[PDB]
Amino acid sequence: INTTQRINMVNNVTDSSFKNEVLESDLPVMVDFWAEWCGPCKMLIPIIDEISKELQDKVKVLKMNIDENPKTPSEYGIRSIPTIMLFKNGEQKDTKIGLQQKNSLLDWINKSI
């Protein structure tokens, strides 16, 4: 018996802190745009948690609730969720829409950084 990999925890970013935590970072940043009413989003949350650990010190992983923070998704053209957006050096680098499984998500991020 060991500690579970279900960290069930990852930092939140808001419309107030997006520039500060995402656009100003030197690390590549992955942002999971989500809401509580979105079924696929809830399936994706634990995957995002696990990937944050597997990508520690390489990619900063954050989630943004779009009910509470509608302005940032609007600015980057997000029309549906789940959306996962990758940022580097103050700009968007890549985006994918929809549930993504863990291996595919890790493959994509590693290809992108």
Side-chain angles (χ1 to χ4, degrees), residues 1-4 6 8-49 51-52 54-55 57-113:
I1 297 173
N2 298 92
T3 304
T4 181
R6 298 163 177 75
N8 300 348
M9 202 158 59
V10 70
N11 284 332
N12 304 291
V13 64
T14 65
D15 282 334
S16 294
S17 63
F18 178 77
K19 179 182 72 181
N20 180 274
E21 283 280 356
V22 179
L23 306 182
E24 292 169 31
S25 181
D26 280 336
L27 297 171
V29 186
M30 179 182 85
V31 180
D32 174 22
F33 296 85
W34 75 283
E36 253 305 298
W37 45 264
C38 181
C41 282
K42 287 177 283 191
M43 294 174 66
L44 181 62
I45 289 297
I47 292 169
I48 297 296
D49 295 340
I51 288 194
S52 181
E54 311 200 12
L55 293 182
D57 305 327
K58 184 162 63 176
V59 179
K60 183 196 299 198
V61 177
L62 304 166
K63 70 178 194 291
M64 183 178 303
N65 179 297
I66 57 86
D67 284 343
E68 294 162 11
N69 305 283
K71 188 192 271 200
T72 300
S74 180
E75 294 173 352
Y76 290 91
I78 297 183
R79 300 157 63 80
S80 55
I81 49 169
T83 288
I84 299 171
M85 197 170 274
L86 310 187
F87 298 84
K88 190 162 185 177
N89 291 337
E91 290 179 318
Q92 177 269 6
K93 182 83 185 168
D94 206 2
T95 313
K96 285 192 186 185
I97 302 167
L99 179 65
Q100 312 284 318
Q101 301 308 330
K102 177 159 136 173
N103 295 335
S104 175
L105 192 48
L106 279 175
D107 284 337
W108 172 47
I109 297 169
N110 281 318
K111 275 175 192 166
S112 302
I113 59 185

